[PDB]
């Protein structure tokens, strides 16, 4: 999926 | 901009074992938390991540031997399944970007496994 | 698995002398840029130092430079101070969103 960190 | 853990101290090994994140000035639902752990000695080892999209993901080793929720919109947890000697170790939260310099991380808290 | 090889282990060199740190991932990192550089003490938690792979973060002399080829990154640190005496890591995140760090790499400054 879309990535969850910065 | 801080972030603190807290529940380490001695526990018995085979005692479930809760860790706490608490953060103050970070957005949980627009920022991701990590949680990090170092054994004495040793090398820095990652845990595992709730995400800012609510996804929740661990280390291939970590998988089973941890679980991480969020409990509060200022809390995070660290369930350490039954725990063993080699789960002995400081324990790390921390707000740490790959792509930004506004990276905070706790001071750590010891988690010893002893009876 | 995902593997972030750091080396060397250890290494010495004198004061203005120069580092070398070279991680070795596994497989790139995200968007191709996911990877910091931290410098960790005892008694303290790790101190950033680079960001973006080569981006300096605020507040770190310039004498630390990040670089790097997609999987292949260094640390290089020049004009040493007996202040650089620390463990260095590499920090990167993948695509499965997962993070990793390298070994580390323990500087002793000689004098």
């Known amino acids: 999926g879309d990535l969850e960190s910065d | 901009q801080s972030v603190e853990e807290s529940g380490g101290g001695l526990v018995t090994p085979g005692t479930p074992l809760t860790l706490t994140c608490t953060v103050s000035?970070?957005?949980?639902?627009?920022?991701?938390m990590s949680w990090v752990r170092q054994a004495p000695g040793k090398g820095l080892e990652w845990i595992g991540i709730?995400?800012?999209?609510?996804?929740i993901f661990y280390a291939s080793w970590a998988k089973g031997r941890f679980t991480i929720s969020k409990t509060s919109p200022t809390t995070v947890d660290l369930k350490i399944t039954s725990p063993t000697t080699e789960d002995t170790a400081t324990y790390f939260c921390?707000?740490?970007?790959?792509?930004?310099?506004?990276?905070?991380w706790g001071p750590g808290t010891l988690v010893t496994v002893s009876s | 698995d995902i593997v972030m090889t750091q080396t060397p282990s250890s290494t010495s060199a004198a004061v203005g002398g120069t580092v070398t740190i070279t991680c070795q991932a596994s497989?790139?990192?995200?968007?191709?840029?996911?990877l910091k550089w931290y410098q960790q003490k005892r008694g303290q938690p790790p101190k950033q130092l680079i960001y973006?792979?080569?981006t300096l973060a605020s507040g770190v002399p310039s004498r630390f430079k990040g670089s790097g080829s997609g999987t292949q990154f260094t640390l290089t640190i020049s004009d040493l101070e007996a202040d650089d005496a620390a463990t260095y890591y590499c920090?990167?995140?993948?695509?499965?969103?997962?993070?990793?760090f390298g070994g580390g790499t323990k500087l002793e400054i000689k004098r």
């Open positions: 921390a707000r740490m970007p790959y792509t930004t310099d506004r990276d905070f």
């Open positions: 000035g970070i957005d949980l639902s627009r920022y991701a």
């Open positions: 709730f995400g800012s999209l609510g996804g």
């Open positions: 497989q790139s990192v995200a968007n191709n840029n996911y």
């Open positions: 973006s792979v080569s």
């Open positions: 920090s990167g995140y993948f695509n499965n969103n997962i993070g990793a």
